[PDB]
Design a protein around this ligand. Structure first.
Ligand SMILES: Nc1nc2c(ncn2[C@@H]2O[C@H](COP(=O)(O)OP(=O)(O)OP(=O)(O)O)[C@@H](O)[C@H]2O)c(=O)[nH]1
Ligand SMILES: [Mg+2]
Lengths: 142, 10, 198, 180, 18, 570, 415
């Protein structure tokens, strides 16, 4: 499962954060800072895969804001990238032309979508339309 | 800016 | 009632680190003053502001009782805000989730699917050694349900309970029996994940 | 400034009041709260966390916050003591062994500077069997007469029967509300 | 007037010191 | 963009040329490589406007190293501008000639430098001296061939006291990089002339004037007394650098001064007010002032004997300023202000800075070790810090107690019972090893030393090399002192450190202990539990040779770093 | 001996740089930001940086870091003095010290930087002299810089010769938590705004203890400043010889003398704080302020800052004199009083709740500081005797001076 998934901007600002492992607040902040420094101190030809703390630290940002994942060394590396791409596509479909400004304003919506998509670091909605329909139904409830 | 650009450009 | 968008705009308008810290402290003081009066109308905005401040790197210890109070509320927005607060600022080491066990048990039998699904997701994300002990029976009850949208959540909750409590996997042996014929992709994936975890 | 709106609101009833639900586990606190809110004795699961509900009587919405008597929930009663104006303690007259524990918990709750303006609300729970004590023996055992600077009232209420809940609510309203 | 003490005239030297 | 700028610069319109120059300057400041347009601006260089001339000169200086070949089209312009009637234009041309890092450019600028050396304008003279110094730094051989040393030396004994100070600074800089052969040292007449012009020099010229006296070594008491009297008025200058230079000069002169004469006493008395004034300077100069005081503290510690109230760290003081204040208090600690030092350490121990708390604890321990009159006070402070329920504070108190026991353990038996049960569950190696050593050496006032060591023996084979060695030493000491209750404990420790211990040094120590136990247990008391001599604490004072060298180097980067001048430069 | 002095920005961008010696590459500025970030995160950040064999000394400015990279063992004090002079010149020329004026006066800023220092040795440091030769809206350099008198420009003509002095007194009291004052020093400030015709030579004269003892009049009230620093125009020779403060007054506001000596008198305002803070229940602020100053002097704009709890909320103020306002940004309550007459006794009773959840980490106990400022009060008792204003042409001057008493480092340690 994904130990922690956090969306951090190029400048270092974090637009999202979702850790599935209970860690101390100071320890979590230190881990996030180290991950940001590693991603911010890594080139574009590093394969987007880093083995930091025995965790598959996969960094793959399609825009100025980057995304990071932390999964155990028990599954294929391409699976994490595919899951990240699927989540990005689902978020773009739910919002519509998702940008950095919209992510900050839609932090609650992004957190709800992430919770409804992956729970506990594992994939919960394999399909892309079912999750979107469920999110829309939950939003329409009020 | 670089923030208003789409994450995937789709 | 300061909106989350207004707080985000105010935070973005600050350039110096000291000015941003002062604005965050003022917002936290306003949120604490509102919470001290037992406000329930603009509780969602205060919860969103507290979550934004915590994500930015601000203390949120005082914003713990408000999340617990909103968790046991009836409003859908208030319930969602409480669930998000429990998932983000609530952890096993926090010790504030002990009182959340009663709220989870009450919401575990809720008729609404979003409330039950949100509670299951929060329990899976913030699985505790003691919370799973008092919630293992509830998770197993929902594992035998025929709800496709809830089957995946039940499987995820069972997997989280097994990971947190390896001795509780003995009660999931007959719950997942005869579950390889699910037409839904999500239900089949959840069943396969549960079988692999077992 | 003008207080015409406040007077108009108070003419038809504006005061609400508050209440608390504390006591030992299996002491009828949840049953008492259900009877106050709904009026029936419904079996409920143990209160791992807390129960939040509101009861409106005599034009006053006396909200009751149920608190469990479990060891893991006993120290959590301080969290519910904040922003609380009233407190109702349910005694277990049928639990002689747990009577001392309930008295100690009540003394600890009343021995806090934060919980000083809340009057004592002792309810003689389990007042349906011959082993249950009266309204004076339970108070004497709990030392309710020695709670100086605290308005403590001992009332006997049976969860199955529901008798005495109205008298306790009226006493609490009289202690809190001092108007005509 | 002015906050912090009104301005006062100053002499040229100590007339008592010759 | 680039083409439009080039077209504008290649036009005959003054407004367009000025706009193009401003755009190029803005692009260069914004981080734009405008060196490619340098040849285009070479033609548009000889302009009547002074604003455009300054911009062209700045572009050439910033684009000289990038395009040395294209800089050959500016020698004629520089030569023409070197004879400009306006003193500002001549000064700018002189500055640009020396600022151009061209090997072949300075060769053709020797004639303009010689022409401007005898400039009557004090600003022109200062510019010529600066250009000569820059040429000497770039090419010492070229400066020597041009014979600018004689002109620089004669500039000191001329008018234009600011120009004289500039020339003196240039000569010192040339000699500073020189190998000391043919130095520009002057006789006492030169020193007197500099002192006479010192009062007429500006703030910048005062530092240059005082720098020359720093290298001069007085040889007579009368000359030293006159120098001290002249430098005394410099202590009443608002300039922090001037005050620091005067203090350094006075300290250097005090090396040859006689303590019998009253001049040294007057200098010491007048130095304290200067140190007090410098201690209240800006935070940037506060560190420099603290470093200067520390460097001069080892030379004349009696100068600031009564300067203790100002050594307290303020609430708004920075971390570096607080550290410097704590270091000054530790170095200036005395029995007269022992109570004040203890109160400051106790107050400093309540701060939220972990590093600050550790520094305060270390300073308190050093004060307790250095002064035995406050040993009881230091022990009480350490006990209070331990009882404060702070992990870092508890570790610092344990370390201080362990250090005091090794230094002054004669009257340290009253803290063994207090330290026996003092939240010993801490796993910090510095505190754990100190506690183990205290228990082993002080295993007389505690009746549960074996029981306390039993808990630490669970992970002795995997705790640490130093921790394991300390535990083995404590077990051996307990067995030698009280083997009735530790006969099995000693055997267990030997077995764990002899069979399950793979450390070479630890294994050798365990084997030696086992051999000593099996050879003569009675002799182990006189061999292992022997009375160690007095512990020689490491002296914090610098060596006398370094102190004398550091006295001359006052206000430099070496004083702040506390390193020799040759050990810090590249 | 800095190789090049440059002005940085809050984001690490260099607003403006000007190399003086060329021995240090301009690319070292980029590494300065990562070094500062690493030092800040580890507590090892210092104003004087070190990038290998080149030291990059930086000063925290209003909006940018004035990084002055150096290569050899240059004068650190000299570099700091040059940076301070450059900052003062920029403040005089530009009223705002930020990125707005850094990129708005680059044409004049570059010229000023070039004229200020050459080859690492500063040459021009007078604001008036710099403005008389370099302007943002060029003639030959003024003769004042070349002449000995670089602090008094000749030829100045004014309709009236009026000089406004300012006897600024800073009362700093370091009161520990035990109730005793540790650091009690009062620093004088004799600043005069001389605006007359010509270049008069001021003859400063006051009731100095040393001067009174020398003259034989050491029997009245005389101010004995432990440290006295003269201005640039003040001649140190006269002061060393016979304490004669004779110097040419500057054109404008300038600091002639600044006394600095310890204070052995009782504090002007006696503030006692009571912290009736309950265990996560409530907080009590028993703040009592006693005016130890003379009743004839009133402390205008007295603001006794009492630090409240960091997580405290819903506070209630019960005071007698002076408005009490709680600022969440400052995390403290300041007992602001518009007028504070001497001998006044102000009592306050703060009461606020606390969150149920305890704080994860401690916040410390910052000292309580007051902002009392009573003008027309001379606590030191030093009275100016005369001001010898002499001009070659001959004119009747009308100098003026005002004594202002304020609170400096008057911080009381919290309990
Ligand atoms: N059947 C019955 N139960 C009573 C009576 N009086 C008190 N009770 C107690 O009331 C309890 C009802 O349980 P809950 O609804 O959970 O309320 P509670 O007593 O506060 O128990 P907790 O919520 O777990 O603290 C029963 O367990 C009984 O022990 C009575 O007259 N009849
Ligand atoms: Mg109940």
């Amino acid at each position: 499962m994904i130990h922690f998934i956090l969306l951090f901007s190029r400048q270092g600002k974090l637009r999202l954060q979702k850790w599935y492992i209970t860690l101390p607040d100071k320890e979590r902040k230190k881990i996030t800072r180290e991950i940001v420094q590693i991603i911010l101190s890594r080139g574009h030809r590093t394969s987007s895969f880093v083995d930091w703390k025995e965790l598959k630290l996969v960094y793959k940002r399609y825009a100025s804001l980057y995304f990071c994942c932390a999964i155990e060394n028990q599954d294929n590396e391409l699976l994490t990238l595919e899951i990240v791409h699927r989540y990005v596509e689902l978020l773009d479909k739910y919002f519509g032309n998702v940008c950095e400004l919209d992510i900050i304003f839609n932090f609650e919506k992004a957190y709800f979508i992430l919770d409804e998509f992956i729970i506990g670091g594992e994939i919960q909605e394999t399909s892309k339309k079912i999750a979107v329909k469920a999110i829309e139904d939950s939003d329409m409830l009020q | 800016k670089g923030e208003n650009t789409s994450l995937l450009h789709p | 009632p300061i909106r989350l968008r207004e707080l985000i705009r105010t935070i973005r308008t600050a350039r110096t680190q000291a000015e941003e810290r002062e604005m965050i402290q003022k917002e936290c003081a306003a949120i604490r003053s509102s919470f001290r009066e037992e406000d329930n109308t603009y509780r969602c905005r205060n919860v969103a502001k507290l979550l934004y401040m915590h994500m930015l790197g601000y203390p949120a210890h005082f914003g713990q009782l408000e999340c617990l109070k909103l968790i046991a509320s009836q409003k859908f927005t208030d319930k969602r805000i409480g669930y998000l607060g429990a998932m983000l600022l609530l952890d096993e080491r926090q010790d504030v989730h002990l009182l959340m066990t009663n709220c989870i048990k009450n919401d575990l039998n809720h008729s609404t699917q979003f409330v039950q699904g949100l509670a299951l997701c929060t329990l899976g994300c913030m699985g505790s050694s003691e919370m799973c002990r008092d919630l293992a029976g509830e998770v197993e009850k929902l594992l035998k349900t025929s709800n496709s949208y809830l089957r995946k959540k039940a499987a995820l909750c069972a997997v989280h309970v097994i990971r947190k409590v390896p001795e509780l996997m003995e009660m999931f042996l007959p719950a997942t029996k005869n579950l390889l014929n699910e037409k839904n992709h999500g239900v089949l994936h959840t069943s396969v994940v549960l079988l692999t975890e077992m | 400034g003008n207080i015409f709106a406040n007077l108009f609101k108070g003419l038809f009833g504006k005061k609400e009041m508050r209440i608390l639900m504390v006591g030992l586990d299996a002491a009828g606190k949840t049953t008492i709260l259900y009877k106050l809110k709904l009026g029936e004795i419904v079996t409920t699961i143990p209160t791992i966390g807390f129960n939040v509900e509101t009861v409106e009587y005599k034009n006053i919405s006396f909200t009751v916050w149920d608190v469990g008597g479990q060891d893991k929930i006993r120290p959590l009663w301080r969290h519910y003591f904040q922003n609380t104006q009233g407190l109702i303690f349910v005694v277990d007259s049928n639990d002689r062994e747990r009577v001392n524990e309930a008295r100690e918990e009540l003394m600890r709750m009343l021995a806090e500077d934060e919980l000083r303006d809340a009057v004592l609300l002792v309810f003689a729970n389990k007042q349906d069997l011959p082993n249950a004590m009266n309204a004076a023996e339970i108070t004497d055992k709990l030392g309710l007469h020695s709670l100086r600077h605290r308005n403590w009232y001992i009332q006997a209420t049976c969860a199955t029967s529901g008798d005495g809940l109205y008298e306790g609510l009226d006493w609490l309203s009289n202690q809190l509300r001092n108007q005509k | 007037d002015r906050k912090g003490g009104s301005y006062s005239q100053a002499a040229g030297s100590d007339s008592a010191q010759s | 963009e680039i083409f439009e700028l080039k077209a504008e610069l290649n036009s005959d319109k003054k407004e367009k040329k000025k706009e193009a120059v401003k755009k190029v300057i803005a692009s260069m400041t914004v981080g734009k490589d405008v060196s490619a347009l340098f040849p285009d601006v070479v033609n548009c260089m000889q302009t009547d406007n002074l604003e455009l001339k300054k911009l062209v000169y700045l572009y050439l200086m910033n684009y000289a190293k990038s395009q040395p070949d294209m800089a050959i089209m500016a020698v004629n312009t520089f030569v023409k501008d070197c004879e400009d009637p306006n003193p500002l234009i001549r000064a700018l041309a002189v500055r640009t000639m020396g600022c151009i890092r061209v090997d072949k450019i300075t060769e053709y600028l020797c004639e303009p430098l010689r022409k401007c050396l005898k400039d009557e304008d004090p600003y022109v003279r200062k510019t010529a001296a600066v250009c000569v110094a820059k040429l000497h730094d770039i090419n010492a051989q070229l400066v020597e061939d041009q014979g600018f040393l004689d002109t620089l030396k004669d500039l000191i004994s001329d008018s234009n006291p600011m120009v004289v100070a500039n020339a003196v600074a240039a000569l010192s800089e040339i000699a500073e990089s020189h190998p000391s052969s043919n130095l520009l040292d002057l006789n006492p007449q030169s020193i007197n002339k500099l002192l006479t012009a010192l009062n007429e020099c500006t703030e910048w010229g005062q530092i240059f004037i005082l720098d020359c006296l720093a290298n001069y070594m007085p040889k007579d008491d009368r000359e030293a007394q006159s120098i001290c009297e002249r430098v005394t008025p410099r202590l009443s200058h608002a300039n922090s650098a001037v005050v620091l230079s005067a203090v350094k000069v006075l300290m250097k002169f005090m090396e040859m001064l006689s303590k019998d004469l009253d001049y040294y006493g007057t200098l010491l008395k007048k130095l304290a007010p200067p140190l007090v004034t410098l201690l209240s300077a800006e935070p940037e100069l506060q560190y420099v002032a603290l470093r200067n005081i520390n460097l001069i503290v080892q030379k004349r510690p009696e100068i600031l004997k009564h300067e203790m109230k100002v050594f307290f760290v303020k609430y708004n003081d920075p971390i570096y300023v607080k550290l410097e204040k704590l270091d000054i208090m530790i170095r200036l600690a005395s029995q007269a202000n022992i109570a004040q030092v203890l109160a400051e350490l106790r107050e400093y121990a309540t701060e939220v800075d972990v590093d600050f708390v550790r520094k305060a604890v270390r300073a308190i321990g050093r004060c307790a070790i250095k002064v035995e009159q406050s040993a009881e006070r230091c022990v009480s402070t350490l006990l209070d810090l331990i009882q404060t329920k702070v992990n870092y504070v508890v570790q610092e108190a344990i370390v201080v107690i362990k250090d005091i026991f090794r230094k002054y353990p004669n009257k340290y038996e009253s803290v063994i019972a207090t330290l026996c049960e003092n939240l010993d569950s801490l796993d910090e190696p510095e505190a754990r090893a100190a506690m183990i050593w205290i228990v082993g050496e002080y295993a007389e006032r505690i009746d549960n030393a074996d029981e306390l060591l039993e808990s630490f023996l669970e992970g002795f084979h995997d705790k640490s090399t130093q921790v394991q060695l300390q535990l083995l030493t404590a077990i051996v000491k307990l067995f030698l002192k009280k083997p009735t209750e530790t006969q099995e404990l000693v055997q267990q420790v030997l077995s764990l450190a002899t069979q399950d211990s793979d450390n070479p040094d630890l294994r050798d120590r365990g084997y030696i202990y086992w051999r000593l136990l099996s050879t003569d247990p009675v002799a182990a008391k006189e061999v292992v539990l022997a009375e160690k001599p007095l512990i020689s604490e490491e002296t914090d004072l610098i060596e006398p040779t370094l102190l004398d060298e550091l006295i001359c180097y006052i206000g430099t980067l070496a004083s702040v770093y506390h390193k020799p001048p040759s050990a810090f430069v590249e | 001996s800095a190789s090049a002095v440059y002005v940085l920005d809050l984001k690490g961008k260099v607003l403006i740089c000007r190399n003086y010696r060329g021995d240090v590459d301009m690319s070292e500025v980029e590494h300065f930001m990562p070094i500062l970030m690493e030092k800040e995160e580890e507590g090892m950040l210092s104003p004087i940086l070190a990038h290998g064999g080149v030291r990059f000394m930086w000063i925290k400015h209003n909006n940018l870091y004035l990084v002055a990279t150096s290569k050899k063992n240059a004068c650190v004090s000299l570099v700091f003095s040059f940076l301070y002079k450059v900052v003062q010149v920029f403040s005089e020329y530009f009223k705002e010290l930020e990125e707005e004026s850094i990129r708005d006066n680059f044409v004049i800023i570059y010229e000023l930087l070039d004229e200020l220092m050459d080859f690492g040795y500063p040459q021009t440091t007078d604001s008036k002299i710099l403005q008389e030769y370099i302007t943002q809206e060029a003639p030959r350099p003024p003769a004042t810089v070349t002449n000995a008198v670089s602090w008094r420009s000749e030829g100045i003509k004014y309709r009236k010769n009026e000089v406004f002095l300012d006897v600024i007194e800073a009362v700093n009291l370091l009161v520990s938590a035990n109730g005793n004052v540790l650091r009690s020093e009062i620093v004088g400030s004799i600043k005069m705004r001389v605006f007359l015709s010509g270049m008069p030579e001021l003859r400063l004269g006051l009731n100095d203890k040393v001067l009174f003892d020398n003259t034989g009049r050491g029997k009245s009230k005389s101010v004995e400043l432990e440290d006295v620093k003269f201005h640039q125009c003040v001649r140190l020779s006269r002061f060393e010889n016979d304490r004669t403060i004779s110097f040419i007054p500057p054109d404008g506001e300038f600091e002639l003398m600044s006394y600095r000596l310890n204070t052995h008198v009782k504090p002007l305002i006696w503030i006692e704080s009571v912290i009736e803070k309950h265990s996560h229940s409530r907080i009590e602020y028993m703040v009592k302020a006693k005016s130890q100053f003379k009743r004839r002097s009133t402390a205008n704009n007295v603001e006794i800052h009492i630090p409240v709890p960091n997580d405290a909320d819903s506070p209630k103020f019960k005071t007698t004199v002076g408005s009490v306002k709680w600022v969440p940004e400052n995390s403290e309550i300041v007992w602001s009083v518009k007028s504070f007459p001497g001998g006044k006794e102000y009592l306050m009773r703060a009461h606020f709740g606390l969150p149920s959840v305890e704080a994860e980490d401690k916040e410390g106990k910052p000292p309580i500081s007051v902002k009392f400022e009573i003008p027309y009060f001379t606590t030191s008792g030093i009275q100016v005797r005369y001001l010898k204003i002499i001009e070659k042409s001959g004119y009747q001057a009308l100098p003026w001076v005002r004594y202002i008493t304020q609170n400096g480092d008057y911080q009381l340690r919290t309990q």
